[PDB]
Amino acid sequence: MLRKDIGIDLGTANTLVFLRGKGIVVNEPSVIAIDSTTGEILKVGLEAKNMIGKTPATIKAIRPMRDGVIADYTVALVMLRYFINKAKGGMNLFKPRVVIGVPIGITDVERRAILDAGLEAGASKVFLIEEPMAAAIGSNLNVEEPSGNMVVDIGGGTTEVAVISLGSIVTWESIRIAGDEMDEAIVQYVRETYRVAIGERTAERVKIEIGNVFPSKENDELETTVSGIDLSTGLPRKLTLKGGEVREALRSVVVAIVESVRTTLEKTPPELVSDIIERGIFLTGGGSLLRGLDTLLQKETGISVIRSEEPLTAVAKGAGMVLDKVNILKKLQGA
């Protein structure tokens, strides 16, 4: 169409862009690298992420999104626009309709922020959409139906657990503890235990290469190495971390995630629980990819837990699909 329909997943880690009629057309890190002095945009997306932690003092790589919402406005807006444009296929004649996914536990203020940043980013109409709602839609689960559907979305910034029914959220919990809060634990684990400082990115790699949360032979045998600075000798050092240590280091966070899942269920009308029980808890979100998280989750709850088919792209998909799911689009907040 002359007016492209965009579903935007503006996350703190990755920003996915869905385009009605063609699938996923933008899929890159929510990072912006500028010139620390002039204020010029150098690169955005993957090229800017690779910059993080390896930049001079004359460059500032910024993660404008923090904890699901806009941490640095004008920066977020500038990023939101690039990604939107890169998607639009190039300046169209008519401003697109945008559905940007947001976390459930967002204040009225953090809300208008994204609504205003969606308009300044060049959009005709902007709707907001709870992330786990889109996540569910973006997986073809019938959210319009009157039957419980529990979703556990663990992104880079926030962990949202939602119980969905009749096109809307019945109960939920949203902690600001997820993917990024995990990297740090790992980073701080190496610092505090091996007295060696590593980078936010080597940690992410560790989180991704051997991140697990359930004790098993396969897992315990896992190993990768980290190269940083030995804070005891100020000498570049390279040490080896085993899966058992990472699991243990991610514990504190893994527990918060689990606690909020428990809490949520505890306050869900029994009729839904009866459903969720036979149906299963849905696990999605980049940060939910930890090894054995479903097993662990399924254990603590006692309910089958099912990993999504495509977690990284489940919100972008939904946010865009909710456009042709008009019975649900009516209940969203717009601008």
Q: Which is nearer to ligand ANP, 209 or 230 (CB)?
A: 209
Q: Footprint of Mg ion on residues 299-328 (CB under 5 A)?
A: 315
Give the shortest CB-240-to-Mg ion separation in angstroms: 32
Q: Does the annotation list 207 as a binding residue?
A: yes
Q: Which is nearer to ligand ANP, 204 or 294 (CB)?
A: 204
Integer-rounded Cα radius of gyration of the chain: 20
Q: Does the annotation list 288 as a binding residue?
A: yes
Q: Does the annotation list 110 as a binding residue?
A: no
State how far the alpha carbon of 293 is from the alpha carbons of 69, 279, 282, 306, in Å.
25, 18, 12, 10
Give the shortest CB-233-to-ligand ANP separation in angstroms: 30
Q: Does the annotation list 289 as a binding residue?
A: yes
At residue 245, what are phi and psi to the nearest 5 degrees?
-75, -45
**Nearest one of 191, 265, 266 to 230, comparing CA atoms:** 191
Q: What b/e readout covers 212-243, taking b as 16+ CB neighbours within 10 angstroms?
A: bbbeeeebeebeeebebbeeeeeeebeeebeb
Q: Which does 211 bind (CB under 5 to 8 A by kind): ligand ANP, Mg ion, none?
A: ligand ANP
Strand order in the sheet with 223-230: 196-197, 223-230, 235-242
The helix (H) or strand (E) run that includes residue 317 is: helix 314-321
Q: Which does 130 bind (CB under 5 to 8 A by kind): Mg ion, ligand ANP, none?
A: none
Is the Cα dihedral 163, 165, 170, 175 positive or negative?
positive
Torsion angle (degrees, nearest 10) of CA 221, 227, 233, 234: -160
Give the shortest CB-56-to-Mg ion separation in angstroms: 32
Instruction: Let me know: does 43 contact 33? Beta carbons within 8 Å.
Output: yes
Q: Does the annotation list 201 as a binding residue?
A: no
Q: Which is nearer to ligand ANP, 250 or 272 (CB)?
A: 250
Give the shortest CB-103-to-ligand ANP separation in angstroms: 6
Q: Footprint of Mg ion on residues 183-242 (CB under 5 A)?
A: none
7 near Mg ion (CB under 5 A):
no
Q: Which is nearer to ligand ANP, 64 or 179 (CB)?
A: 179
Q: Footprint of Mg ion on residues 117-156 (CB under 5 A)?
A: 155
Q: Does the annotation list 171 as a binding residue?
A: no
Other residues' Cβ atoms within 10 Å of the Cβ of residue 267: 11
Other residues' Cβ atoms within 10 Å of the Cβ of residue 53: 12
Q: Which is nearer to Mg ion, 171 or 288 (CB)?
A: 288
**Nearest one of 197, 294, 285, 188 to 246, comparing CA atoms:** 188
**Nearest one of 253, 203, 244, 251 to 225, comparing CA atoms:** 203
What residues contact residue 248 under an 8 Å CB cut-off, 6+ apart? none
Provide DSSP, 41-82: EEEESHHHHTTTTS--TTEEEE--EETTEESSHHHHHHHHHH
Q: Does the annotation list 88 as a binding residue?
A: no
How far is 237 from 14, CA to CA, in rounded Å? 31
Q: Does the annotation list 287 as a binding residue?
A: yes
Give the shortest CB-58-to-ligand ANP separation in angstroms: 27
Q: Does the annotation list 30 as a binding residue?
A: no
Give the shortest CB-316-to-ligand ANP separation in angstroms: 9
Judged by the rule CB under 6 A, the positions of this chain that interact with ligand ANP are 9, 11-14, 68, 131, 155-158, 178-180, 204, 207-208, 211, 285-287, 289-290, 311-312
Give the shortest CB-64-to-ligand ANP separation in angstroms: 12
Q: Which is nearer to ligand ANP, 33 or 203 (CB)?
A: 203
Q: Which is nearer to ligand ANP, 63 or 237 (CB)?
A: 63
What residue ranges bind Mg ion (CB under 5 A)?
155, 315
User: Which residues contribute to the annotated binding site?
Assistant: 12-14, 156-158, 204-207, 286-289
User: Which residues contribute to the annotated binding site for ATP?
Assistant: 12-14, 156-158, 204-207, 286-289
